[PDB]
A paper describes a structure:
Membrane bound histidine kinases (HKs) are ubiquitous sensors of extracellular stimuli in bacteria. Here, we used solid-state NMR in conjunction with crystallography, solution NMR and distance measurements to investigate the transmembrane signaling mechanism of a paradigmatic citrate sensing membrane embedded HK, CitA. In accordance with the naming of the PASc domain, the periplasmic domain is termed PASp here. The PASp and PASc domains are connected to the TM2 helix by two linkers: the PASp/TM2-linker and the TM2/PASc-linker (topology and domain organization shown in Fig. 1A).
Citrate binding in the sensory extracytoplasmic PAS domain (PASp) causes the linker to transmembrane helix 2 (TM2) to adopt a helical conformation. This triggers a piston-like pulling of TM2 and a quaternary structure rearrangement in the cytosolic PAS domain (PASc). The contraction of the overall β-scaffold of PASp leads to a random coil to α-helix transition in the PASp/TM2-Linker. Based on chemical shift assignment (BMRB ID: 51759 and 51760), we are able to extend this helical characterization to four more amino acids up to I158, which is only one residue away from the predicted membrane embedded region based on cysteine accessibility in the homologous protein DcuS8. This result is in agreement with the conversion of the disordered region downstream of the last β-strand in the PASp core (residues 152-158) in the citrate-free state to a helix (P-helix) extending to the TM2 helix, in the bound state. Structural changes include the P-helix formation, which promotes the piston-like pulling of the TM2 helix, and the amplification of this upward motion by the helical conversion of residues 180GAVG183, which border the membrane and the cytosol. The large change in quaternary structure upon citrate binding detected by CODEX, is represented by the high-resolution structures of PASp and PASc dimers, and together with changes in secondary structure identified by NMR chemical shifts, the mechanism of transmembrane signaling is revealed.
Numbering used by the authors: 32 to 161
The structure:
Amino acid sequence: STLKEQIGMRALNVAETVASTSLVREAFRDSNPSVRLQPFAERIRQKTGAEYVVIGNRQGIRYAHPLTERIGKSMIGGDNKEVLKGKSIISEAVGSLGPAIRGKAPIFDENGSVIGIVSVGFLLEDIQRT
């Protein structure tokens, strides 16, 4: 319905597409998943025009973020719990980069267990003039 709601639904479509990309689950088995995930997430961020395509593990530790300083630190916003249960969500929260609408999708392993999170966001300040 609203433009913000539609941007959220697009963000979740991107997050579920990223989460289902074979490279992403495979990279979780690497000694340092960031080596393959950071360049992949940056290409999707460029294609989609999202503020970020964040990829994190079950502890909320980032493997990919547009700011490399954020890699290896905890995701911010307090909206991971439902995703770690295997549910996709559209969430408005304050991330490290500020208030955003995010589509957040679980990453499943080859057995269907949740191993991580994809978060695709657009800052609220970019949806309408403050």
